[PDB]
Ligand binder design. Structure first.
Ligand code: RET
Ligand code: R16
Ligand code: D12
Ligand code: D12
Ligand code: D12
Ligand code: D12
Ligand code: D12
Ligand code: D12
Ligand code: D12
Ligand code: D10
Ligand code: D10
Ligand code: D10
Ligand code: D10
Ligand code: DD9
Length: 226
């Protein structure tokens, strides 16, 4: 009875339902281009379902000493994000036909974001937790910069309906993603202001929006068809 359990349970349910809905729709499509978007986009909440379920059952949680106390850190979030965040970037890349080398650079940056975020989360010297946070946030900002300036440029060579879908998904991504570093800084991993139960609520809202919300928008569009 960690009080955050309720949001881990709701997160589990929403990621599950979203995965099932997307699989059902995905299995029914025959267009090859649309299939690739369905495969990527169904896997996103499926992974998140597995990690939410794991946390709900008490796995992916460790205690890290800093600031003179033992602090609960959910590390399973990073195992989700490691794979889900680049898959979302891959959906955006495929929509705008990004260059292969831009994709690699973004996936690289994304692994740096998640891996330095996790190192920060497990670091025992309080000050140095923020150093890793800042490196992670830099990597995130590079990603957003590229999505905002580079991908929008590529998108403008596409038909308007593809460009328009990309722009909504870009906007969703920039708003949601930019919130994660702030939650971490003020929550249990950082300054310890916002209690773990509220923090789990906030990451559940963000996660569901960034995966299922995003997917609803992408998979209902005409832009994914060939
Ligand atoms: C910058 C930054 C972070 C960014 C996380 C992001 C952007 C998560 C996105 C999650 C999604 C889209 C889930 C689905 C962390 C790792 C919290 C750690 C501290 C700094
Ligand atoms: C040659 C121009 C280089 C531009 C340098 C920008 C550095 C700071 C970027 C901070 C990220 C902003 C993200 C924008 C996303 C909406
Ligand atoms: C206590 C919170 C968990 C709620 C679980 C709901 C499970 C799926 C509901 C299906 C209804 C559409
Ligand atoms: C219920 C779990 C579903 C996850 C399916 C997504 C994976 C797509 C693989 C690509 C098909 C060859
Ligand atoms: C083709 C490029 C491969 C890896 C690129 C990494 C991009 C910069 C990350 C900034 C982190 C602070
Ligand atoms: C007392 C020591 C000063 C601490 C330095 C803080 C620097 C903030 C820079 C943030 C980089 C993104
Ligand atoms: C002891 C004085 C240290 C003050 C450092 C402040 C400058 C932070 C630089 C961050 C640049 C990104
Ligand atoms: C609209 C944002 C409201 C921010 C709430 C501030 C949290 C203050 C905590 C006081 C510590 C006991
Ligand atoms: C035990 C909890 C005491 C502090 C309450 C602060 C709540 C912060 C929520 C801010 C939302 C952004
Ligand atoms: C004590 C109440 C236990 C109920 C657990 C419900 C979680 C279900 C996830 C769908
Ligand atoms: C929603 C589709 C089912 C995903 C199966 C994976 C379950 C592993 C949880 C530990
Ligand atoms: C007190 C330690 C500060 C050193 C942090 C330097 C990190 C820059 C790497 C990108
Ligand atoms: C301490 C109670 C205040 C927290 C409310 C947080 C609202 C988040 C909704 C997305
Ligand atoms: C990915 C770059 C690693 C830089 C490490 C700085 C941490 C020193 C406390």
């Amino acid at each position: 009875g960690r009080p955050e359990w309720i949001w881990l349970a709701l997160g589990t349910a929403l990621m599950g339902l979203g995965t099932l809905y997307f699989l059902v729709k995905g299995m029914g499509v025959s267009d090859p281009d649309a299939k690739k978007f369905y495969a990527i986009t169904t896997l996103v909440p499926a992974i998140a379902f597995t990690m939410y379920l794991s946390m709900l059952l008490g796995y992916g949680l460790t205690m890290v000493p800093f600031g003179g106390e033992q602090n609960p850190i959910y590390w399973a979030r990073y195992a989700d994000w490691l794979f889900t965040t680049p898959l979302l970037l891959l959906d955006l890349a495929l929509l705008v036909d990004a260059d292969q080398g831009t994709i690699l650079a973004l996936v690289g940056a994304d692994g740096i974001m998640i891996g330095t975020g996790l190192v920060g989360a497990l670091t025992k010297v309080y000050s140095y937790r923020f150093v890793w946070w800042a490196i992670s946030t830099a990597a995130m900002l590079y990603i957003l910069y590229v999505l905002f300036f580079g991908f929008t440029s590529k998108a403008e060579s596409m038909r308007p309906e593809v460009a328009s879908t990309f722009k909504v998904l870009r906007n969703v991504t920039v708003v949601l993603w930019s919130a994660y570093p702030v939650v971490w800084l003020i929550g249990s991993e950082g300054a310890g202001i916002v209690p773990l139960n509220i923090e789990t609520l906030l990451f559940m809202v963000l996660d569901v929006s960034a995966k299922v919300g995003f997917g609803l928008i992408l998979l209902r569009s005409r832009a994914i068809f060939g």
